[PDB]
């Protein structure tokens, strides 16, 4: 019927461990890693080992991995008991659990049986950190680096504390002072904290229309402009006719009317085979010719 129900029915099958069992599995795991590394190093160093012993070490690995899997499957309950507290914060319960299990896996990889501390003591750190670190990396549709998620929560903490002391929402100055940062920074920070809204929401009454329907596509073509723009190209064509054959081409290349990419004086002078200063001189005269009332009066309307 329900999935989260199923996961619990299976982890509940595994038998919890006592302090003594944890160390034994811990030992078997470390023996499994060293045994596996020893076999790999001996081939690198051109060394051999007793046949029977070498085959014994290989089995140490099979027993080591069973220890690793067994250790995890026992403390899965601990992951859930920690994952309950972070529900409703923008992350599905299961996702919290799985991320907790990821943290749990690392704890097993770094746990130390020689310290004599109960396993749950050191695993809670990693499992806890694994979940929190996950939320900062996944809870927001627009991701924010953990350090920024870190400061945002710190600011909200100061805000909530300052809110409780003063009896009024602390201003950017009060909030910046207590946090030892510029008021403009807290403002820039307060902009980052905002989360997006759903276009598929229904702002119209009784589902008359979703919110997305009211969004303009400002990039869409404007029919009247595409026609005026087309008439402007045609009108410039005539204006180009009044200029010199070479003089018209210089204006085209200088602004890129023909190929759509402008050209510097040198490049323009390179196609006409003259100095880059000569092109500068020619262009200036074209503009003067273009500013003449006869040639220029027609194009003012196009602003």
């Amino acid at each position: 019927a329900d999935s989260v129900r199923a996961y619990l029915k299976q982890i509940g099958k595994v038998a919890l461990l006592n302090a003594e069992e944890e160390v034994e599995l811990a030992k078997r795991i470390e023996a499994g890693l060293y045994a596996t590394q020893k076999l790999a190093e001996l081939a690198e160093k051109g060394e051999k080992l007793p046949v029977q012993q070498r085959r014994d070490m290989q089995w140490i690995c099979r027993d080591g991995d069973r220890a690793k899997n067994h250790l995890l499957e026992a403390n899965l309950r601990l992951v859930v008991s920690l994952a309950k507290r972070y529900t409703g914060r923008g992350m599905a319960f299961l996702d919290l659990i799985q991320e907790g299990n990821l943290g749990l896996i690392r704890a097993v990889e770094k746990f130390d049986y020689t310290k004599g501390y109960k396993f749950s003591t050191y695993a809670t750190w990693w499992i806890r950190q694994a979940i929190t670190r996950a939320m900062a990396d996944q809870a927001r549709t627009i991701r924010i680096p953990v350090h920024m998620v870190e400061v945002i929560n710190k600011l909200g903490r100061i805000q909530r504390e300052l809110l409780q002391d003063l009896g009024r929402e602390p201003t950017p100055e009060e909030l910046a002072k207590e946090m030892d940062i510029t008021p403009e920074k807290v403002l820039e920070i307060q902009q980052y904290a905002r989360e997006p809204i759903s276009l598929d929401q229904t702002i119209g009454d009784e589902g008359d229309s979703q919110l997305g329907d009211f969004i303009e596509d400002s990039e869409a073509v404007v029919a009247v402009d595409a026609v005026s723009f087309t008439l402007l190209q045609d009108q410039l064509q005539s204006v180009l006719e009044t200029l010199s054959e070479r003089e018209a081409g210089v204006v085209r290349l200088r602004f890129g009317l023909t190929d759509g990419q402008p050209r510097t004086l040198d490049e323009i002078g390179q196609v006409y085979g003259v100095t880059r200063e000569r092109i500068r001189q020619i262009e200036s005269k074209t503009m003067s010719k273009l500013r003449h009332p006869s040639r220029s009066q027609v194009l003012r309307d196009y602003l």
Binding site: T171, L187, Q190, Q191
Partner: protein, 84 residues
């Protein structure tokens, strides 16, 4: 219409605007709406209807005083419907 008032909320002037907002101004425009053909009139008895036309006061059914009538209402209330 005409512009009545303007409310300017700046940032230099401390004020208090949502994060990022520098200046906030609102303009209030008023309009004097003459009763125009198409508007919806109605009495207190549920009778309602639009303004189909507005005749000059000259060509309007007027009493012997020369006192023109203001509005001409057809007999909406069919029998049984009443609207007494």
């Amino acid at each position: 219409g005409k512009v009545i008032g303007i409310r300017v909320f700046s940032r230099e002037d401390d004020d208090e605007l949502p994060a990022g907002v520098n200046e906030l101004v609102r303009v209030y425009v008023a309009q004097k709406r003459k009763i125009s053909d198409g508007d919806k009139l109605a009495g207190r008895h549920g009778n309602k209807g639009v303004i189909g036309k507005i005749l000059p006061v000259e060509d309007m059914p007027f009493l012997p005083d020369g006192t023109p009538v203001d509005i001409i209402l057809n007999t909406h209330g069919v029998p049984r419907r009443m609207n007494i």
